[PDB]
Amino acid sequence: SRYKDNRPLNILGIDISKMELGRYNLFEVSIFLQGSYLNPFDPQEIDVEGIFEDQYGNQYRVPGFFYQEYKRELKNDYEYLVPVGDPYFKIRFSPINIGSYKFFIKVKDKTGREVSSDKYTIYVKESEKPGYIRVSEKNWRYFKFDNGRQFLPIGANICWATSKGTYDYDVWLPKCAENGGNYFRVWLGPSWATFALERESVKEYDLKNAWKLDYVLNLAEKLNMYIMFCFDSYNELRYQKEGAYPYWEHTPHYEKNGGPLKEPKDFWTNNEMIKYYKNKLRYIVARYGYSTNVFAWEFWNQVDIISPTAFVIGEVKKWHEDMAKYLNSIDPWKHLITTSFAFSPGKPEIDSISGLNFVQTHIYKSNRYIDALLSLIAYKEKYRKPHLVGEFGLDAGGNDLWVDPNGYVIHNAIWTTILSGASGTAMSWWWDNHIHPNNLYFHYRALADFVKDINFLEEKFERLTNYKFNVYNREIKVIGLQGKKYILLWLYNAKEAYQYKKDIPNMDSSKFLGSIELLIKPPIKVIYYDTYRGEKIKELDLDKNVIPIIEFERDLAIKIELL
Template sequence: MSLKILQLIFVLLVLIICTGVSQTPVYVSDYADNRPLKINGIKILRDKVEKYGLFEIILDLQGKYNNPFDPEEIDINCIFIDPDGNEIKVPAFFYQDYERKIQNNVEILNPVGKPHFRVRFSPTKVGNYKFYIIAKDKTNNVVKSDLYSFTSLDSKKSGYIRVSSSDFRYFEFENGDPFIPIGANICWAGGRGTFDYETWLPEYAKVGCNYFRVWLGPSWTTFAIERSSIREYDLKNSWRLDYLLNYAEKMGFYIMLCFDSYNELRYRKEEAYGMWESTPHYIQNGGILKEPKEFWSNEEMQRLYRNKIRYLVSRYGYSTNVFAWEFWNEIDIISPSAYIPELVKDWHSKMSNYLKSVDPWKHLVTTSFSGSSGKPEIDSLSGIDFVQTHIYQGSNYIKYLIGLFNFKSEYKKPHIVGEFGLDAGGRDPYLDPKGFAIHNAIWTTLLSGYAGSAMSWWWDNHIHPDNLYFHYKALSDFISGVNFPKENFKTIESYKFVNTDRDIRLIGLKGEKNTLIWLYDNNVIYNYKKDIPKILLTGPNFLLKLDNLNNGTYKVIYWDTYNSKSIKEEIIEVKDNIANIEVPNFERDIAIRIEFLK
């Protein structure tokens, strides 16, 4: 065979191989731009804002980019210089304004104006801030704005929520005020969208709640930002979340934003509401993954997830009413083929570090598991600021809640019950029409050392239609004025009951100024078919002998845990470090608050 023939065969083979290699198509958004990079204008919405308030800029910027949501295509940052000369970098985000209306009981959003880039920032110091914009498009051209300024005024706002510096079990604001989260999951709405929240949140506010949880995925949820793509974000749902955050601030609520749920990486055939086949991650839906397990190792998927984190922080991170970022809802029940422990752990470690690196306001970070015991290898990561428990159990859950608190105390982090119910299948309204399980769970958690009250899952088919909000009022009123992080609470372990043969159980915390106790009759506490109980019954009182209290004078308040009122109050003297508490005869449960006077 001649040399020329061999060369021809080689060329043909190369052509066959090259034409057989599939090229990843360039993603082009409907919002792509192909004009020369230029800053046409900067509009400052307010040049004076309160400390911890919202400073916002509208950018008129053009450039050459295929996707305004991808910083590799168009990277716009605002560099802020605080009064002490420190620089803070905040990315711009792509935005479309809307107006909302209700039509046939469905929320309709109509666009207002043209889409554009914005910058949001919250100053944490009082004084003069300077800033400038710097942008780079896909051609690597760079433009930089002039230097601008605004003034941050003093305010009475409490700041961002942190883990308490006094007691790792609890949360507090930057100014040192305690934050004890009391509330429920309110993860999505019905067809009425944000209008549903204007029905629900005022009811929670009336009873002293201050906290709820929202999902940003899967793609069908009210605030899903990845509704149809993982490369760009749904501007309507992003605006809905803007609206909800603003409304939450007005109403005094703090939100845990959950980025994703296990459903997205679970096959339909595996049941438990798996929806992999319809998720935007799936290659057949325009995504990049052929199967769920690739989520943890695909480099492009990691880049796109970092882009999502960047977008969420740049758009919502300014808000002090963002309580925490939550990576996953129940990540341990994705497809068994996709849950690879080392990869999931490594992903949480890397993403939590990245999130903290791009969030100048340092919001708290968490994740959650379906298994109530969690995953120690992830819960113990330094990038996870607090741990959660999800528990659905029809009986003896009080015992298990206390056991789970003790088990996870080794992490030395705040611990909240992120989901609670009797039945994960949705039968709580039938099993417990009066909400006794919600009642039991919120009193158990807060008085056993958890950072807040257990969060019921059934907000739209149980709490609201059955009007169970009152359960929260009794608890929030009972703890009013108690500074949990400063109390140095210890679990009450040394006590005894006298003059009763009932199976009375005690859960409580003894602090430096306040001792908080919840007593319940174990024989009736799991009975859900009765009406709201009477606190005072005929019959003799019984004695609670409480050890290890400091000698002195105390005020004892006996509390109706259903009607949220004091049954009676008395002054007692503690001698020999023993308090003798005359407990009224009650039907189901009662709370007692003991305040040190002198």
Template sequence: MTFPLLHPPQIPAVRPLVSTKVAQYRMAEYSVKVAGSFVDPFDPEDVALDVRVTAPSGKRLSIPGFLYQPYRRTVGRATQPIAISTTDALAAGKASPTRTVDDAEIMVPSGPTEWRVRFTPREVGAHRLEFVLKTRQGVARKAGPALIATKGKGGFVRVSPRDRRFFALEDGASYWPLGANIAWAGARGTRDYDDWLAEYAKAGANWGRLWLSPHWATFALETKKLGRIDLGNAWRLDYVLRVAQGKGIRLALCIDSYNVLRDRVSWPEWERSPHRLLLKRPADFWTDQVADRLYRNKLRYLVARWGAFTGTMAWEFWNEVDGTADYKVAPIRAWHERMADFLHRIDPYGHPITTSFGGNGEGAGDRSVFELKGIDYTQSHRYDDPDLALGVFAAEERLGSLGKPHFVGEVGADASGDRAADDPEGLQVHDPLWASLAAGAAGAAMPWWWDSYVHPKKLYGLFAAAANFTKRVDFDREGFRSVTPSVRFEAEPNPLPRRDAVPLADGVGWSAAPFHKPLTVRIDRNGMNAPRLAKLQQGVGNHGDLHNPVTFETDLPWPTRLVVEVGDVSGYGGAAIRIVRDGETLVEQAFPDPDGDRDTATLKQYAKDYIVEIPAGRHRVTVENPGQDWFVANYRVVDAVERRAPPLLVRAVVGRRTAIVWARHEDRTWRAAVAHKKIDPIAPTRLTLSGLAKGQWRVERWDTWSGKRLGCTNVTVGTDGLAHLSLPRIENDLALKLIKL
């Protein structure tokens, strides 16, 4: 019997790819020639290259190396993988798993594989380097040339030590993320990013978010062989990170999306995932020891290849993890705790770590995951809010209270499409952005639909307006506090105008909750008394224990009408709506599921408004779902309540030397704009802002669409901390920036 000859590890040569003298926070890179016997270059138990760094302070660091291959971009005809909405649609021939295009980006290897190490010095002075190669046959060591770091600026993003609700750079500069999701490209590949990043940079944006899975994404790392890295897509990510970093844009890298552990419906990828080679079902991923080991190997590769980029803003474990099959929070929370601990230990640069949940985050227990010590910042995803600004305020109130940075990581008017024809000017980008500023969020609300909406409609000016406004605002130095300014008419109108009564309907979840039971909303001429309602009206079948009809009790001297805005309907059996006024059934409509449970995709065809007239006097109107499963519902009682204050939605944050105020016409919601609802301008008003330091303040008025300053005045604040300000006639919105003199 003969055995293969196993060779001990060797490091014949180390070649610097840049100068051995770099600025602090600038990346050095080395090509390392290795020899020895090993099988899997992506398994550190088989082969591991590291550089041991001794910094000028004496601090010791371990920097992992990685397998690299150079590529060049070409253009030609190619067949590319694409997403599918359901596996049933694929089986029925209604969807294709691929597309063939003539203008595709094709990655062509331009050289052999080699080992590389990237290192970014964070101290000034001489760094000693020792390269270490470890295989199953032993360990080899080789001293490398000293690396000299001169004084630099910038550095990696950190949770600010001055105010842990915000971010900062290592050199102390404040960092307020502003940008959009740019998760994947079209057939043009990285050429799309050449265009997009140039536009965002010109607008002053400084943030973006990329997806590293599923397999059809531009930067998909996993191959059909579990545990292997796609070196062509890794080169693409190198390229885009270098371009973004050169333009001052930092990218959050979202490592995985729920799709890879989702089967059958809602954009599933389980059937095409390499995890099927190891696991019997998607939910096994969270507890399987081999899956854990493979994921740690992937994290090591991520840190080795992209950790040294200061343009890597953060690591995000999962996009909308609650979308995975058979979701249960306990094992997923434990998984996040294990992986966050591991990633913090191996990442010498200390990038912030996060994860994300879908619109059902609250019901999925996202708070219990975000509370983990290893999760550094939190985020929300908001879609389908009738008033997008209120959605941002609600998200900040809920997760901002954890004392960690929080911002809305995805926002859009409609989760099912960009609605570009309905919103060509970008209201669904504009309002969440300015609401984030006024709410004291750690960053802007980041729009989705970057490729089909933001870029084609050339909405980059909306980011430029916010970038101009936030110049020289040091968010983590202000100690911002949220306040709600009071507003009043300069001269009270007679008769008083009226407004719609709109209860908040955003409660989500699949377990017992205050909004999963029958509730009553009471409305009279002076206002509305409403509990928080559920986003979903539950039927009597699938989740009968959550059945939650809503009753409206009105006592008004004028007639009104109730508008029930029905949105998505469950694809697991459909739903129905019944509206009863004073015991008389006025609306009875079924929303049947045409194919039963064969295709469980959400039903879009039943979206419309259901309207019931309500005469003057006392009345009782109940909205109920007697169907099998849920439908999305929002409610409006039209012109019901007298306006004793101007119809302004106003929020503000007040800091030591800066205050930010955003005032928007209360009726100019995204939903109203799409419906082309006529909205009368608001006459001049008086606003009182509290919590300011005594002294002189400059008050700047800003146009939030153009990013131009409209004018400024000075105001004196006394010991009561109040500033009394006059607002001009407002048609849409207005921002104020107060600066202590």
């Protein structure tokens, strides 16, 4: 109990970040206090709350959180954080309406005594921010912002840094954002992760790693990027003898290391673990929930591959239902909630729970992965909620960077997924050893520039069907979407798309290859789009439903508009 206090409860100071701010922007209150509590991360010991009310009478109950300021530096090849001042408590709020808000601070400690502040008034003006990310009511395949504009996630996993810590995100994130990226995913466990909250304990959370997560979230805010926070990873509950980067023997949950659990199976039902997990969820909502740059709360990375001694489908299902309900109940902004599985088809008993707002796929497959992606996307339409291909790569023991230094595998997957009806791009692994050093960001820029000017929420897009190729020299295949105004096609050469040794196509391509007939009413306008340079190649007006295919090396995109 490093941070215990044993004084009579009193507020000693309140600092307010700003008295005027914009819609969806951060309003931060700092609270200095003394009190009686053993653990500032446990609301049964000390419960700080901010109670906000807009001019329409809507109320927001915002939990407060314990905070330590740090100043970062780089010591050669590792980040080092120097503490600045004593720790204290914070409230982080974000207004969804404009106008006036009234708020006050309340504190209760373990003695039952409660203290409170004076009522304060702040004023909120309109801003440019689009709001929080939600499921689209117009098309359940897709996400939207509160203002109604679509959110199509384009990006990659960026789940942890090297020892350089936040200094790596200073490099990766601007490159991603300047190349059309608006999405990444970070890990808050296991204990070795950059942002691990349960580093040494499951009862108290790591203030240094929480500060690093603040830093990265703030960088996302400046760059208009949106983050999935993955709370726990399967390694935590996987025994050494089971392989696959196991971590049970080292995890703070295990009794050997101070935690409540004798074996990982007990995670789902142990009363003490459940209590502390809810405290962690409260801490995460308190510290990060304000942010519209939090796209989603993800409970687990690949919960299906915890130890087989520990995976009890009915227990894991109930825990997800209960935790989703709890998290929603305490999150004033109701961020999206999800979970993930290593098994590519997922676990229907869990994926179908209403409390999980969207479903995911992880897939590492080397052969015919285009067809596998399409099949999984078609299959998961049964859930009638969005689908994110949250992890993707070859099944090559991590050798993607040697097999495919030009990123053709990523290229194929991002085009396939977007134009098959997934909510956004397939999300690559290997951000640090592949995407960045091989400078693969240009693939995302080309795709973003192709899709960004179409409102996917309103096109009534369906996976393409009723097509017929007429091509003699080659084997060309298509992944497509057909909507009420646009048809989007990705064509690929089946004999070239899965070979990765040749240099990036430098198109100079005038010849006719063949045609593809679609079930459309002319007249139409046809745009041919170079998927590597990210530019229009040619434009052609047509009076029939038969699209010439111009010459291309590997793959080519086509945008058709019903006129």
